Paper text:
Omniligase-1 is a broadly applicable enzyme for peptide bond formation between an activated acyl donor peptide and a non-protected acyl acceptor peptide. The enzyme is derived from an earlier subtilisin variant called peptiligase by several rounds of protein engineering aimed at increasing synthetic yields and substrate range. Mutation A225N in the S1′ pocket and F189W of the S2′ pocket increased the synthesis to hydrolysis (S/H) ratio and overall coupling efficiency, whereas the I107V mutation was added to S4 pocket to increase the reaction rate. The final omniligase variants appeared to have a very broad substrate range, coupling more than 250 peptides in a 400-member library of acyl acceptors, as indicated by a high-throughput FRET assay.
Residue numbers in the entry: 1 to 75, 85 to 278
The structure:
Amino acid sequence: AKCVSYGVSQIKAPALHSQGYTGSNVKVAVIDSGIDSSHPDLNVAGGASFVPSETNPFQDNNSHGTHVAGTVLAVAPSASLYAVKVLGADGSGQYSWIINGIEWAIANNMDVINMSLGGPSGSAALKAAVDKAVASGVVVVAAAGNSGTSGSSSTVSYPAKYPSVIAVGAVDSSNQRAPFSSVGPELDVMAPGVSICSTLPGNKYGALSGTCPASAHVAGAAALILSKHPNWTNTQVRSSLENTATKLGDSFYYGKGLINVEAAAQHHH
């Protein structure tokens, strides 16, 4: 919205905006550090905190959840955001809190979950939660991780590494993989994640880099697609994103390539 970012153009979201599609009547759970609901550039429809030391989901003492929220709305200006707080101010949280946030999102009929987070190990309970959300029809998106490379090893974080999740890596403004962007066969798509200007807490704006902003673009893209195709299943939304991506190089580094929401939203299955 108020801070200009190249990322919205890069994924061809303006083509949907010109068609009149802005993610109307789509519920997106921002599973992160909260959202500063006081920010003039944001609107928050609901939410919940599972961080025992940080009980307000509508404040953000980390900044990432608020930044992610702004990127989702830059891509899908009409999306309904829900602040699902599972990370503290230091950007860490327990998997049980994260799972409680996913469970809340399922119970409250979210259309899209964005998880701008991950750890190097997952759990069976974490996999069961994302698999259940996907079985329930939710589009589940996660940041692939900022762990760079490890030779031929996967560095994709959990829960992005699980097959049911859309694992999002980060490119720069010229579609080059960002040096921090995690890699491996579990990587699904890329999106803009270098120096992305978005909302920060306390009526502020600023650039951040990471797979966190990249995931936000794909969560916004899912909302644009559902506004044009509200009947599409999560299966069909996911297919539309992966099958119409712009190929960028070896799938170990780039997955299917850069999301193209214009192409995805006119995909014929």
